[PDB]
Design a binder for these strands. Structure first.
Ligand SMILES: [Zn+2]
Ligand SMILES: [Zn+2]
Lengths: 121, 120
RNA sequence: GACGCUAGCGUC
RNA sequence: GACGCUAGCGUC
């Protein structure tokens, strides 16, 4: 099934977002739309910011819970956007209908409705 | 179908899948003296005990300018046999020449004959 | 060897 | 972020 699911912080199990809000960039990197998600993480400047492809890595992002702060990925400037790029190995996927939890390590293995990124949203 | 194993670094022939035997559905060895000629052994720098056999030596390609790490040599029951890691080799289908790079034994599906003490 | 983990480095 | 490579540590 490619039904909607929620991502929970792997360390504290707090809700982070839903698969409906996830968008794919270059069929390789995954970001999250919406302002609600922006409240769920904090950023911190990247100690070794490197550049590659079409965007620029500025900071790492972590769980906003002060009792977690699990590494969630990075924040990058892509074209004219400042957007979060998350790594799936930092989360637990939960199916909304059953509660079943899955621990993935790479995005290639997680098969869900991978809605491509739309600059208009 | 039968396949041969080549050294990942220099592509030298190591053995054929027909000679491979599985111990406790988890560790892979090879029978016959021909294979014994293709590798050299070396006392393991971190020997240790687990399950039913002791890790005594590290083994490497005998070809010297290659010397690619192939695994270890162990004492298992009344035999001392080599145990190899597929990640150190290229699998080539003999009929087609197609070369395959595996990382884990779980992924290479072939006739996995269990080790039998009466042979070798 | 079979798996897991930490650190570091390299490419777009 | 996505891969890739080292080194070390642990378990059986
Ligand atoms: Zn958390
Ligand atoms: Zn070799």
């Amino acid at each position: 099934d490619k039904e909607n699911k929620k991502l929970l912080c792997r360390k504290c199990k707090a809700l982070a977002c839903y698969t409906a809000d996830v968008r794919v960039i270059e069929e390789c990197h995954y970001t999250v739309l919406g302002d609600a998600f922006k409240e769920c993480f904090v950023s911190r400047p990247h100690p070794k910011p490197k550049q590659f492809s079409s965007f620029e890595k500025r900071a790492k992002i972590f769980c906003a819970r002060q009792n977690c702060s699990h590494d969630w990925g990075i924040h990058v400037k892509y074209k004219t956007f400042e957007i979060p790029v998350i790594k799936i190995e930092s989360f637990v996927v939960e199916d909304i209908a059953t509660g079943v939890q899955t621990l993935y390590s790479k995005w290639k293995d997680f098969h869900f409705e991978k809605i491509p990124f739309d600059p208009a949203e």
